[PDB]
Amino acid sequence: TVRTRVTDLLEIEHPILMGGMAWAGTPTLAAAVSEAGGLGIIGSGAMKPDDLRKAISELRQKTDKPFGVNIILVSPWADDLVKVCIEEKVPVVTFGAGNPTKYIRELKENGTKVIPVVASDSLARMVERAGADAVIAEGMESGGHIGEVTTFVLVNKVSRSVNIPVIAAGGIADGRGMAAAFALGAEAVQMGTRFVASVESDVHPVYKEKIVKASIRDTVVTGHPARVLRTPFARKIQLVGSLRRAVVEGDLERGSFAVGQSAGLIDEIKPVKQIIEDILKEFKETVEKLRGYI
Amino acid sequence: TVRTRVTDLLEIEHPILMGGMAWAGTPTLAAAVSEAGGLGIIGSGAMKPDDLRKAISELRQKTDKPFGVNIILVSPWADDLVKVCIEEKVPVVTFGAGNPTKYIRELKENGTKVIPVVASDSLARMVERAGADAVIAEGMESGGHIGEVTTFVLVNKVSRSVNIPVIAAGGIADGRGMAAAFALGAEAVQMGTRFVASVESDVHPVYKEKIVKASIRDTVVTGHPARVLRTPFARKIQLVGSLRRAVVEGDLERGSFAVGQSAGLIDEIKPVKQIIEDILKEFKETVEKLRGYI
Ligand code: NA
Ligand code: NA
Missing domain, CATH: 3.20.20.70 (Aldolase class I)
Incomplete structure (x- = not known):
């Protein structure tokens, strides 16, 4: 310690x-x-x-x-x-x-x-x-x-x-x-x-799996800028309830997966x-x- | 050493x-x-x-x-x-x-x-x-x-x-x-x-002075992204010879001042x-x- x-x-x-x-x-x-x-x-x-x-x-x-x-x-x-x-x-x-x-x-x-x-x-x-x-x-x-x-x-x-x-x-x-x-x-x-x-x-198991799989280059800055995973919804944005849909529902379609570049350092x-x-x-x-x- | x-x-x-x-x-x-x-x-x-x-x-x-x-x-x-x-x-x-x-x-x-x-x-x-x-x-x-x-x-x-x-x-x-x-x-x-x-x-004395004065927040990403000082020309862009005009001529008007965020750590x-x-x-x-x- x-x-x-x-x-x-x-x-x-x-x-x-x-x-x-x-x-x-x-x-x-x-x-x-x-x-x-x-x-x-x-x-x-x-x-x-x-x-x-x-x-x-x-x-x-x-x-x-x-x-x-x-x-x-x-x-x-x-x-x-x-x-x-x-x-x-x-x-x-x-x-x-x-x-x-x-x-x-x-x-x-x-x-x-x-x-x-x-x-x-x-x-x-x-x-x-x-x-x-x-x-x-x-x-x-x-x-x-x-x-x-x-x-x-x-x-x-x-x-x-x-x-x-x-x-x-x-x-x-x-x-x-x-x-x-x-x-x-x-x-x-x-x-x-x-x-x-x-x-x-x-957080939903899908949220965890996306962090594991994500590399150091798999986030994007969209919008008041915000960093999220390079997901279909992040593409369509380039918002209300979108963070809850990712965290609670694991929604790949319209969830905002607010994760940092350190996801590329996380493999399990x-x-x-x-x-x-x-x-x-x-x-x-x-x-x-x-x-x-x- | x-x-x-x-x-x-x-x-x-x-x-x-x-x-x-x-x-x-x-x-x-x-x-x-x-x-x-x-x-x-x-x-x-x-x-x-x-x-x-x-x-x-x-x-x-x-x-x-x-x-x-x-x-x-x-x-x-x-x-x-x-x-x-x-x-x-x-x-x-x-x-x-x-x-x-x-x-x-x-x-x-x-x-x-x-x-x-x-x-x-x-x-x-x-x-x-x-x-x-x-x-x-x-x-x-x-x-x-x-x-x-x-x-x-x-x-x-x-x-x-x-x-x-x-x-x-x-x-x-x-x-x-x-x-x-x-x-x-x-x-x-x-x-x-x-x-x-x-x-x-x-580099032109103005280039040096801008680095000294610049804070950690005084750069912008423009464009093939490139980070430059928050200069009038960087505003107008939001290019040919623009880097030379800053480095050689110290041109604040149409020079591209390619400096990193570490300029905010440089005070002299x-x-x-x-x-x-x-x-x-x-x-x-x-x-x-x-x-x-x-
Ligand atoms: Na990862
Ligand atoms: Na400085």
Whole structure:
């Protein structure tokens, strides 16, 4: 095991977060990641406050360990979903789709750790100023809605610009990537596609099979750009409910398969426990390898 | 100094290559990088055989150390430029814009090290089979014509797929990036924009100033996609001679400023010697930092 400012901040064992996408970020997958020592994350993007309350309850029936809730800022229920996180003492809240400054203070005053997802250097500095505990720097190789900067560049610039810990997201699916992210300045990694491709993930079996089969070149950017698998529906687009149809129904015809380029690094569906074991082992072997040079 | 399979293969001191873009890859910049212990590279993309012959001669008037020539496969003079490299005993030849399999054997039979630039896992395996000595895995954050895969993903997958050394290109401008690339599996790095932004680079002063001022978000992908600075001409395009107008004339109006996202990591024009010194120092500090975790 490796210790970082992020495992200290979040009071977890491993510096590894799952994605917490809508529909795929279920309490079942989040509970598995958290119990395994990482940070499971409930994706509330498609949730109403009642749905999130239930989701939090069923996660806590499985694990006592820390967990996060991801809130999409453009959701009509965003204010109320933040209020749910405060009332249910959610330990960690991540944000997507913009600047969550308006919520940071009330979350922090009530003891929640706040970690906005950013695709820019300027936004990172802004949310640091507004009180963020850490930031996720998400490169555009990730799946779903994306920014413009790649992980290799973004993590480097963001970590140099802030003093709070940086978490790298996008393109990370193994221990090599964890070491590479740490070299760029990150102190944890978020691996959305890798944990969607797990035994404990409840995405449709077809979703898992497509990730396994997909190469590093099998995603496309369509549209507010978003990265999805090169599926028939992604061709026809070049949208409402399309992500749910892929995740829940495995619909190859009109599902949007929001997966990142790291799908080309994923060749089999693994248990969450094995994923975390293999990451840590390869991270350590990679660092020993680098040490050989100096 | 750090030793890798690439410094052994190329018989150079440091595992650091410059870009060798057309117009910017001049003998003056290449000679400076090679004499400083890296691999300077003459960019022949806009050259006729006579031009390349002269270019090689003037580089050798400055340095006795190894150097490369980059050949663009779609150039009408590609066959003849390869023949020039054979006759003038060019130690290293890189290729861009496709599959250079048809030339590998004659170059290798005459003692030249052949390093194709690839943007895919499949092409990398193909050129390995055809006899390549190493491959440059170039992520789409680089400037100029680009593939689809980012460095973070591409270097990882490519290095796992071949046994020959992999050189990482795209997004690398400092020692952190060198360590990150090595973690993903690379054994050298190519830093086009970083060496264009050098005292010994002969690109127009405006070109250098734009790189310095540019942030990580100040490039755009236009068109055969190509990454350029967010300039008025890049807006109007959304082309013939446009790269020369930027590099040679510093034309903000109709120059194509082919620079990568790593321009946002570059805040000043440095001597080539200092660039290489700072890379090596930060690479070693980064590896020591990673060692702290294990
Ligand atoms: Na795959
Ligand atoms: Na800059």
